[PDB]
């Protein structure tokens, strides 16, 4: 059929300037990321250092759902340009450069040890016993 | 094989070290063993240091609280010919298990036999772990291992620190530090 | 005939006339076993003081 | 001079070893560059 | 409806985009040719058990770029936006990744030569006076 | 066997049995989650390590040019009468100098020893 | 076409060449050349801008500027220094150090009126001959009798107060590559040493340690535990685990903690291996308490939690693998680089690699003159810029005005040279303790023959019998016959004569062509994707992986063979058993020259031997015939993956198989010997201790040492 030697030429796009920048999130696969669940995203600068020169933090469904901070990549792409194409009704191919490159990991929601009481369970050095019953103490 | 000599050697003996470097122990045969070479081999082995790591080939541990579980493929007929008398069985067993295998071949270099193997590990630990027993006549000499019943750290980190205990230290045959002869 | 080529392992079990024996016999056979002999005087002293 | 030192200079320098041992596998299990990989022949290991 | 919450209505749209890594000189085409409309045409061949993917150069911008696809099952991309209004909305989540290569095998290191002694040209290194310098104290 | 992970929380698993059904119950201890175990097996350790190299031998070594190479012995899917042989160079694997032959086709591979 | 038995009149018409246009000390004349252009000027740039207030003042420096070297003489009138002169009359043979000081003033009210103290004298910097920066440079035999020099003395030389000094080649273990150890009876069972350094303009060399607690304490619930895994951190009092470390770099899950460090799944003993270290952490769950807990055993703890924080953050930001990088938002590659080295030590742990051995000229690399001036150069300009500092504070605390003819001190730099380079006491005057001793000798200069050993020498550190033994390595790299007699025997050693080592070069041409070579930068990557791929080394630090190996580095060796881009003394290895490629730049590697074999024939052919036998009034000569891709240089590290012919006509020739994939062929065998050890006739045939006591005495085998002795 047709597939068997489909052939398809479509247009390249791009504009000088857009009003609005354009930046990536990137998830690990073995994270097992679901876009169902979105059903509510907040994403905020963290307020650890405490603008532009800071981590990003983002929150899945406010408290209940995950939790993702950002990084942006330390390296520089002085010689590369990534660009992300968009279909379109017209067909004709837009590439647009990808200003930053924000990486967000899943942050564990739990009971934490802090490290105030965590100087308490480093007397049990190498004596810590039944490392499954020291977060059920807690 | 040889033993080290020369100004090393000197400066060992002149110092009275607490550790030689290469420290070795000549012995002579009294009797009819002297003569004997196989009476010589069974006085090797006799001396010869054999730790469980020396003569076991592969360590597993299982959950079978069930006793004719049997998760092993060819478990079936030892466990039963075992287990139709129920040895303290009602009152506990941990179904964490241990099982290990002793490799045909040290079996035979060694000149041991498992059944004493077995007779060692029971006396030196007392009542405290119960052991089973296995027939020649499987491929694989098989060795089933359990814990006791009277009786925190679980079942599985004790079990395995038995585990570690006895394949470092469980010396099987021999005076310890030898390491060859 | 039995014995050994540690010190203080002899030392422990036989005793200090073993040490005096085993040490005289076992400086011998080093400095020996190049072919180099050397007299028994001076063996026995050392082994001796 | 001994007998060895008129055999070596007139026959076979013999062995030549490094702390007992044949010559070491300084390089990826092999003597020098010139020698195919993982080779305990004579001449690749010393004897000369 | 909040100023931090994230617009996940592309998302929701299973929209589909590509990431693509481009050479320098061909960035610094599109820089020079600032976007005057159209820059190239991209061509995808597809066969009955193959498929090809290239990009043609702009004849008038250079007064064949073929794609190699990437595996994307090793992670998953998604592309957000921060408008100027402080907006942030996500445009889509990316289907495939695509990578630039030049057809030059051997004449393309002049030109990467080229631009090697542009990135050396401010590299500083001192230079030698014949004479002293006599202006000091 | 292996091991696995979350569902939905990206958290390493421990094993567990159920108290009820008796059935070993992979649960997470970090968390809420838990699963039927199909294995039915928890732990597994060859100390003496009789798994063979082959499981692990480079395919690419072949087209490495400093390795021997000898014509006898072809491979078996291709004729391809032409090979390459080194040791283990491995240790504590095991104390036998068996060689390994891997076929040198461009796309080719097939590894065995004899 | 080819050479068949002519052989002897090639090889050594080739080395004609190799020599009429290199000669003996191009090793020093190459480091000093290189470290006068760069590493001055390098050093000077990357210097902390001096801020001081008020009024706020700051002070930028600019391009270095450089004179002929002159004499100051009572009158001050300016005069060319000749290096004869210097000998006679016990002057050291300088030139002086000029430099640009922008000096910007902010007053709070758009006062900025910056000066530019244009050539600015800040010292005298010893000038060593023939050098390019010298005087002697480019004179013929005519103007060089005419001014009382001798033609054949080969230079490389300084000169302080009369006497004749040479720096002395060190070794230093190799930076920024990880190593692995098996200490014999330490308590760590295995160690990995990963001894890095930014690129050699920043701050000096910082350790990082990873090791592996031995079986101990058994019986108990300890060997349960099993072996952990602990690495000492740089400026940490104390020892800590890795996963916490990991955690402090920002990573939670321990999903991709061990995505990090395994990169197939299907490992199940490796996995056993590293759960201790899980099993351990397991009390650590999110980067601020993991932060707090390694700052809060440092060298001097925080007076409040968010200065604990805030030195761990610190410690690992700069302190920790500079080499990656210190850009702030480089933590991922910081990540990774960890993930890789306890790898490589779980590796080791298996036995599925070998320990590497520490006395492999492969792992090391040579200080020489460069290197040892430009860290020289650093100490002293460091303590300039704090000399500047606190005149200019003390002097404006009083708030008059500022005057930097006066404030800077030429003094300091010139003299911290002049002793360091005279006595050898290699450092600060103050700290001769920690100074390393031995450096810069007194030439000797009783034969042509004891001069040109003395320029081409080596030294190791080492104050048993392991580090000072001959070891396979240094095939045709270092004189096997030659060592001194004496206490220091093995630990001296003489270069071959056909040796040269690494100027260095910067690794950013090498890094755009792979980035723009299909090559996946290690950020944008599917952690997944690594085991099935092959790794990239740039001077150590992990940038990527690449999927199709043999294409890269055909192409790399192509780019190599016609000088590219790439530079020619650029080296590039293929571990195919451990799927890396590994490329290394930097200065202080040591290489020789071999002929490249393709197929099974030599690329130099006929008409380059005619060409080369008709060198003069032909402009050819040995760059040119590397420029055809005949000759190629190989160091140590390449030469431990490639394959060497001693003879073509004996072994290129085919034969009884033995093998047929020569990759390079030797120039002449003979190579290997150092200078002292070739004059000897028949080495061959003589006993090697005879011959190592006669190159002993080549030294002290009396002559016309020069000719312009009277
Ligand atoms: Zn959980
Ligand atoms: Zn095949």
Redesign the pocket.
Same mark, same amino acid.
């Given at each position: 059929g047709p597939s068997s030697q489909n052939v398809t030429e479509y247009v390249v796009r791009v504009p000088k300037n857009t009003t609005k920048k354009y930046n990536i999130m990137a998830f690990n696969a073995a994270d097992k990321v679901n876009f169902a669940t979105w059903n509510q995203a907040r994403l905020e600068r963290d307020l650890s250092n405490k603008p532009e020169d800071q981590p990003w933090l983002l929150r899945v469904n406010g408290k209940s759902g995950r939790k993702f901070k950002g990084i942006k990549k330390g390296g520089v792409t002085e010689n590369t340009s990534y660009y992300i194409f968009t279909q379109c009704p017209d067909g004709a191919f837009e590439a647009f450069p990808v200003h930053n490159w924000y990486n967000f990991t899943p942050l564990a929601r739990h009971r934490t040890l802090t490290a105030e009481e965590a100087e308490e369970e480093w007397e049990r050095r190498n004596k810590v016993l039944n490392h499954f019953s020291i977060m059920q103490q807690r | 094989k040889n033993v080290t000599l020369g100004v090393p050697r000197l400066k060992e003996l002149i110092n009275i070290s607490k550790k030689p470097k290469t420290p070795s122990l000549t012995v002579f045969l009294l009797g009819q063993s002297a003569r004997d070479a196989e009476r010589a081999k069974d006085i090797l082995c006799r001396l010869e240091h054999t730790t469980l790591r020396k003569v076991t080939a592969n360590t597993a541990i299982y959950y079978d609280p069930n006793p004719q579980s049997t998760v092993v493929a060819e478990d079936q007929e030892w466990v039963n010919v075992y287990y139709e008398m129920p040895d303290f069985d009602v009152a506990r067993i941990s179904p964490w298990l241990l099982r290990v295998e002793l490799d045909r071949k040290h079996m035979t270099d060694r000149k041991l036999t498992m059944e004493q193997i077995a007779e060692k590990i029971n006396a030196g630990f007392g009542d405290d772990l119960n052991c089973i027993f296995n027939d020649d006549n499987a491929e694989k000499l098989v060795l089933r291992i359990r814990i006791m019943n009277s009786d925190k750290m679980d079942d599985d980190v004790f079990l395995r620190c038995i585990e570690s205990n006895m394949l470092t230290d469980m010396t099987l045959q021999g005076i310890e530090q030898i390491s060859k002869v | 005939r039995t014995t050994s080529n540690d010190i203080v392992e002899i030392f422990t079990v036989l005793g200090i006339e073993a040490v005096r024996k085993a040490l005289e016999r076992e400086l011998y056979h080093v400095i020996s076993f190049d072919g180099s002999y050397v007299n028994y005087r001076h063996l026995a002293l050392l082994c001796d003081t | 001079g001994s007998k060895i030192n008129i055999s070596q200079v007139i026959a076979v320098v013999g062995q030549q070893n490094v702390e007992g041992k044949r010559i070491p596998f300084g390089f990826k299990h092999r003597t020098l560059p010139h020698f195919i990989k993982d080779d305990y022949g004579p001449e690749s290991r010393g004897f000369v | 409806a909040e100023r931090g919450e994230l617009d996940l209505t592309g998302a929701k749209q299973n929209t589909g985009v590509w990431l693509v890594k481009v050479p320098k000189y061909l960035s610094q085409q599109w820089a020079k040719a600032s976007g005057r409309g159209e820059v190239g045409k991209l061509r995808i061949a597809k066969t009955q058990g193959r498929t090809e993917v290239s990009f043609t150069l702009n004849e008038d911008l250079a007064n064949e770029h073929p794609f190699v696809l990437q595996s994307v099952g090793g992670q998953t991309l998604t592309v957000f936006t921060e408008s100027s209004s402080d907006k942030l909305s996500l445009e889509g989540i990316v289907v495939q990744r695509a990578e630039c290569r030049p057809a030059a095998s051997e004449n393309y290191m002049r030109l990467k030569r080229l631009q090697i002694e542009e990135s050396s040209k401010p590299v500083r290194l001192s230079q030698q006076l014949d004479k002293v310098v006599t202006t000091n104290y | 066997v292996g091991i696995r992970f979350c569902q939905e929380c990206n958290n390493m698993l421990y094993p567990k049995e159920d108290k009820e059904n008796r059935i070993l119950l992979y649960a997470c201890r970090n968390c809420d989650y838990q699963q039927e175990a199909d294995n039915s097996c928890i732990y597994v350790n060859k100390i003496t390590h009789e798994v063979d190299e082959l499981t692990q031998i480079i395919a690419d070594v072949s087209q490495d040019p400093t390795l021997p190479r000898t014509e006898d012995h072809? =491979?078996?899917? =291709?004729?391809?009468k032409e090979?390459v042989f080194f040791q283990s160079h491995s240790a504590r694997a095991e104390d036998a100098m068996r060689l390994y032959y891997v =076929?040198?086709?461009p796309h =080719?591979?097939?590894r065995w020893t004899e | 076409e080819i050479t068949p038995d002519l052989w002897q009149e090639a090889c050594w018409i080739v080395i004609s060449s190799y020599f009429d246009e290199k000669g003996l000390v191009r090793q020093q004349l190459d480091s000093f050349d290189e470290f006068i252009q760069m590493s001055v000027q390098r050093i000077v740039e990357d210097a902390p801008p001096i801020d001081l207030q008020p009024p706020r003042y700051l002070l930028k420096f600019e391009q270095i500027y450089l004179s002929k070297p002159t004499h100051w003489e009572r009158d001050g009138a300016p005069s060319p220094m000749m290096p004869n002169e210097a000998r006679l009359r016990n002057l050291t043979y300088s030139a002086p150090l000029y430099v640009d000081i922008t000096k910007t003033v902010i007053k709070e009210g758009e006062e900025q009126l910056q000066t530019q103290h244009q050539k600015t004298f800040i010292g005298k910097i010893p000038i060593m001959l023939r050098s390019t920066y010298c005087l002697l440079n480019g004179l013929t035999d005519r103007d060089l009798c005419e001014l009382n020099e001798c033609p054949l003395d080969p230079g490389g030389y300084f000169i302080i107060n009369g006497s004749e000094k040479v720096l002395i080649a060190q070794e230093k273990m190799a930076t920024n590559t990880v190593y692995v150890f098996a200490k014999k009876d330490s308590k760590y069972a295995y160690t990995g040493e990963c001894r890095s350094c930014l690129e050699n303009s920043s701050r000096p060399t910082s350790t990082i340690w990873v090791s592996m607690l031995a079986r101990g304490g058994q019986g108990a619930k300890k060997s349960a535990i099993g072996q952990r895994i602990v690495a000492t951190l740089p400026y940490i009092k104390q020892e800590v685990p890795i996963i916490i470390v990991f955690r402090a770099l920002g990573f939670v899950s321990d999903r991709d903690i061990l995505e990090h460090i395994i990169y197939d799944f299907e490992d199940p003993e490796m996995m056993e291996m590293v759960k201790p270290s899980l099993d351990e952490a397991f009390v650590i769950q999110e980067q601020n308490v993991a932060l707090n807990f390694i700052g809060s055993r440092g060298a001097k703890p925080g007076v409040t939690k968010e200065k604990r924080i805030k030195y761990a953050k610190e410690v690992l930001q700069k302190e920790m693998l500079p080499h990656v990088g210190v850009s702030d938002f480089c933590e991922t590659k910081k990540a990774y680089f960890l993930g890789y080295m306890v790898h490589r030590l779980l590796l080791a742990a298996l036995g599925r690699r070998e320990l590497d051995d520490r006395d492999h000229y492969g792992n090391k690399r040579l200080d020489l003159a460069g290197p040892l001036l430009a860290f020289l150069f650093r100490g002293m300009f460091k303590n300039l810029l704090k000399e500047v500092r606190i005149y200019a504070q003390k002097f404006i605390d009083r708030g008059k005005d500022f005057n930097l003819e006066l404030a800077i001190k030429t003094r300091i730099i010139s003299d911290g040279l002049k002793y360091s380079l005279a006595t050898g006491n290699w450092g600060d005057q103050k700290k001769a303790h920690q100074a390393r001793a031995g450096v810069s000798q007194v030439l000797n200069r009783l034969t042509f023959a004891s001069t040109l050993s003395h320029l081409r020498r080596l030294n190791s550190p080492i104050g048993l019998a392991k580090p000072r033994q001959l070891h396979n390595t240094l095939w045709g790299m270092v004189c096997p016959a030659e060592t001194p007699e004496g206490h220091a025997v093995g630990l001296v050693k003489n270069l071959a004569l056909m040796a040269y080592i690494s100027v260095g070069s910067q690794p950013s041409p090498i890094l755009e062509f792979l980035e723009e070579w299909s090559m996946e930068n290690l950020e944008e990557i599917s952690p997944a994707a690594i085991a099935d791929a092959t790794k990239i080394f740039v001077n150590g630090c992990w940038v990527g992986i690449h999927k199709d190996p043999e294409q890269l580095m055909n192409t790399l060796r192509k780019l190599r063979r016609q000088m590219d881009i790439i530079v020619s003394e650029v080296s590039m290895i293929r571990d195919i058993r451990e799927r890396e490629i590994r490329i290394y730049t930097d200065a202080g590697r040591i290489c020789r020259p071999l002929l490249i074999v393709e197929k099974q024939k030599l690329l130099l052919k006929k008409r380059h031997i005619d060409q080369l036998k008709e060198r003069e009034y032909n402009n050819y000569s040995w760059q040119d015939l590397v420029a055809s891709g005949v000759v190629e240089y190989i160091d140590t590290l390449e030469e431990e993956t490639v394959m060497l012919a001693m003879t073509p006509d004996d072994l290129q020739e085919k034969e009884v198989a033995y093998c047929s994939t020569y990759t390079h062929c030797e120039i002449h065998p003979s190579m290997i010997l150092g200078v002292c050890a070739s004059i000897i006739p028949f080495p061959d045939h003589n006993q090697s201790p005879r011959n190592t006591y006669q190159s002993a005495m080549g030294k002290q085998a009396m002559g016309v040492y020069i000719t312009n002795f009277h």
């Amino acid at each position: 059929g047709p597939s068997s030697q489909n052939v398809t030429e479509y247009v390249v796009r791009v504009p000088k300037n857009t009003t609005k920048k354009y930046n990536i999130m990137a998830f690990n696969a073995a994270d097992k990321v679901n876009f169902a669940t979105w059903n509510q995203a907040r994403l905020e600068r963290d307020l650890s250092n405490k603008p532009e020169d800071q981590p990003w933090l983002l929150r899945v469904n406010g408290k209940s759902g995950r939790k993702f901070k950002g990084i942006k990549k330390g390296g520089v792409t002085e010689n590369t340009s990534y660009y992300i194409f968009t279909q379109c009704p017209d067909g004709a191919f837009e590439a647009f450069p990808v200003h930053n490159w924000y990486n967000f990991t899943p942050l564990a929601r739990h009971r934490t040890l802090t490290a105030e009481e965590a100087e308490e369970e480093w007397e049990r050095r190498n004596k810590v016993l039944n490392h499954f019953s020291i977060m059920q103490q807690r | 094989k040889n033993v080290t000599l020369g100004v090393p050697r000197l400066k060992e003996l002149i110092n009275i070290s607490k550790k030689p470097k290469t420290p070795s122990l000549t012995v002579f045969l009294l009797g009819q063993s002297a003569r004997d070479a196989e009476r010589a081999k069974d006085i090797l082995c006799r001396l010869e240091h054999t730790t469980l790591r020396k003569v076991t080939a592969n360590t597993a541990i299982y959950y079978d609280p069930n006793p004719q579980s049997t998760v092993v493929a060819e478990d079936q007929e030892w466990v039963n010919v075992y287990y139709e008398m129920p040895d303290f069985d009602v009152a506990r067993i941990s179904p964490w298990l241990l099982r290990v295998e002793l490799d045909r071949k040290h079996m035979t270099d060694r000149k041991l036999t498992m059944e004493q193997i077995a007779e060692k590990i029971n006396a030196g630990f007392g009542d405290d772990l119960n052991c089973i027993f296995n027939d020649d006549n499987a491929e694989k000499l098989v060795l089933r291992i359990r814990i006791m019943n009277s009786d925190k750290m679980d079942d599985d980190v004790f079990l395995r620190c038995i585990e570690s205990n006895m394949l470092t230290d469980m010396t099987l045959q021999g005076i310890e530090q030898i390491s060859k002869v | 005939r039995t014995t050994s080529n540690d010190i203080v392992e002899i030392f422990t079990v036989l005793g200090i006339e073993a040490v005096r024996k085993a040490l005289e016999r076992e400086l011998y056979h080093v400095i020996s076993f190049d072919g180099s002999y050397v007299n028994y005087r001076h063996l026995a002293l050392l082994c001796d003081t | 001079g001994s007998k060895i030192n008129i055999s070596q200079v007139i026959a076979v320098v013999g062995q030549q070893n490094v702390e007992g041992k044949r010559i070491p596998f300084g390089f990826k299990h092999r003597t020098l560059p010139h020698f195919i990989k993982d080779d305990y022949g004579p001449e690749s290991r010393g004897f000369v | 409806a909040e100023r931090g919450e994230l617009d996940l209505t592309g998302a929701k749209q299973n929209t589909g985009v590509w990431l693509v890594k481009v050479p320098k000189y061909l960035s610094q085409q599109w820089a020079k040719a600032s976007g005057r409309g159209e820059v190239g045409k991209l061509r995808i061949a597809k066969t009955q058990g193959r498929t090809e993917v290239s990009f043609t150069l702009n004849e008038d911008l250079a007064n064949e770029h073929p794609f190699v696809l990437q595996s994307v099952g090793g992670q998953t991309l998604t592309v957000f936006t921060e408008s100027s209004s402080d907006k942030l909305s996500l445009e889509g989540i990316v289907v495939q990744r695509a990578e630039c290569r030049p057809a030059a095998s051997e004449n393309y290191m002049r030109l990467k030569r080229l631009q090697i002694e542009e990135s050396s040209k401010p590299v500083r290194l001192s230079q030698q006076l014949d004479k002293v310098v006599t202006t000091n104290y | 066997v292996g091991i696995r992970f979350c569902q939905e929380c990206n958290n390493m698993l421990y094993p567990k049995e159920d108290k009820e059904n008796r059935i070993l119950l992979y649960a997470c201890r970090n968390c809420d989650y838990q699963q039927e175990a199909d294995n039915s097996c928890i732990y597994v350790n060859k100390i003496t390590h009789e798994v063979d190299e082959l499981t692990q031998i480079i395919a690419d070594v072949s087209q490495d040019p400093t390795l021997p190479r000898t014509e006898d012995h072809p =491979c078996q899917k =291709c004729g391809h009468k032409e090979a390459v042989f080194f040791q283990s160079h491995s240790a504590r694997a095991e104390d036998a100098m068996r060689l390994y032959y891997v =076929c040198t086709a461009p796309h =080719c591979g097939h590894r065995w020893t004899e | 076409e080819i050479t068949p038995d002519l052989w002897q009149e090639a090889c050594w018409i080739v080395i004609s060449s190799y020599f009429d246009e290199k000669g003996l000390v191009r090793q020093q004349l190459d480091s000093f050349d290189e470290f006068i252009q760069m590493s001055v000027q390098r050093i000077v740039e990357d210097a902390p801008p001096i801020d001081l207030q008020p009024p706020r003042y700051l002070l930028k420096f600019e391009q270095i500027y450089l004179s002929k070297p002159t004499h100051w003489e009572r009158d001050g009138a300016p005069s060319p220094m000749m290096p004869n002169e210097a000998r006679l009359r016990n002057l050291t043979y300088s030139a002086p150090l000029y430099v640009d000081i922008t000096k910007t003033v902010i007053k709070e009210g758009e006062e900025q009126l910056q000066t530019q103290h244009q050539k600015t004298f800040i010292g005298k910097i010893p000038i060593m001959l023939r050098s390019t920066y010298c005087l002697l440079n480019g004179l013929t035999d005519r103007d060089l009798c005419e001014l009382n020099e001798c033609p054949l003395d080969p230079g490389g030389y300084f000169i302080i107060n009369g006497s004749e000094k040479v720096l002395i080649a060190q070794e230093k273990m190799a930076t920024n590559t990880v190593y692995v150890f098996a200490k014999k009876d330490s308590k760590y069972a295995y160690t990995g040493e990963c001894r890095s350094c930014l690129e050699n303009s920043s701050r000096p060399t910082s350790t990082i340690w990873v090791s592996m607690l031995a079986r101990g304490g058994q019986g108990a619930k300890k060997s349960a535990i099993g072996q952990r895994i602990v690495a000492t951190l740089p400026y940490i009092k104390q020892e800590v685990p890795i996963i916490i470390v990991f955690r402090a770099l920002g990573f939670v899950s321990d999903r991709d903690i061990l995505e990090h460090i395994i990169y197939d799944f299907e490992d199940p003993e490796m996995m056993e291996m590293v759960k201790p270290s899980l099993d351990e952490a397991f009390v650590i769950q999110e980067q601020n308490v993991a932060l707090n807990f390694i700052g809060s055993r440092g060298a001097k703890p925080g007076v409040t939690k968010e200065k604990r924080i805030k030195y761990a953050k610190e410690v690992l930001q700069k302190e920790m693998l500079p080499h990656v990088g210190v850009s702030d938002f480089c933590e991922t590659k910081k990540a990774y680089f960890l993930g890789y080295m306890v790898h490589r030590l779980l590796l080791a742990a298996l036995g599925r690699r070998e320990l590497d051995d520490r006395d492999h000229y492969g792992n090391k690399r040579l200080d020489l003159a460069g290197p040892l001036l430009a860290f020289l150069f650093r100490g002293m300009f460091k303590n300039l810029l704090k000399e500047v500092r606190i005149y200019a504070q003390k002097f404006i605390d009083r708030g008059k005005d500022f005057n930097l003819e006066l404030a800077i001190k030429t003094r300091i730099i010139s003299d911290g040279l002049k002793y360091s380079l005279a006595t050898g006491n290699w450092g600060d005057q103050k700290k001769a303790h920690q100074a390393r001793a031995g450096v810069s000798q007194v030439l000797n200069r009783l034969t042509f023959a004891s001069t040109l050993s003395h320029l081409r020498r080596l030294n190791s550190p080492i104050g048993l019998a392991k580090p000072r033994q001959l070891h396979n390595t240094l095939w045709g790299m270092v004189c096997p016959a030659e060592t001194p007699e004496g206490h220091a025997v093995g630990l001296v050693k003489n270069l071959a004569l056909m040796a040269y080592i690494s100027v260095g070069s910067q690794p950013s041409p090498i890094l755009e062509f792979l980035e723009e070579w299909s090559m996946e930068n290690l950020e944008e990557i599917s952690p997944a994707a690594i085991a099935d791929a092959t790794k990239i080394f740039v001077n150590g630090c992990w940038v990527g992986i690449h999927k199709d190996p043999e294409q890269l580095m055909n192409t790399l060796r192509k780019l190599r063979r016609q000088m590219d881009i790439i530079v020619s003394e650029v080296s590039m290895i293929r571990d195919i058993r451990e799927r890396e490629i590994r490329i290394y730049t930097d200065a202080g590697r040591i290489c020789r020259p071999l002929l490249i074999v393709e197929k099974q024939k030599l690329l130099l052919k006929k008409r380059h031997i005619d060409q080369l036998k008709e060198r003069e009034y032909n402009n050819y000569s040995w760059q040119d015939l590397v420029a055809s891709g005949v000759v190629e240089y190989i160091d140590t590290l390449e030469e431990e993956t490639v394959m060497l012919a001693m003879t073509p006509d004996d072994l290129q020739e085919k034969e009884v198989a033995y093998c047929s994939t020569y990759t390079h062929c030797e120039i002449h065998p003979s190579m290997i010997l150092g200078v002292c050890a070739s004059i000897i006739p028949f080495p061959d045939h003589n006993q090697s201790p005879r011959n190592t006591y006669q190159s002993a005495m080549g030294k002290q085998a009396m002559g016309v040492y020069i000719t312009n002795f009277h």
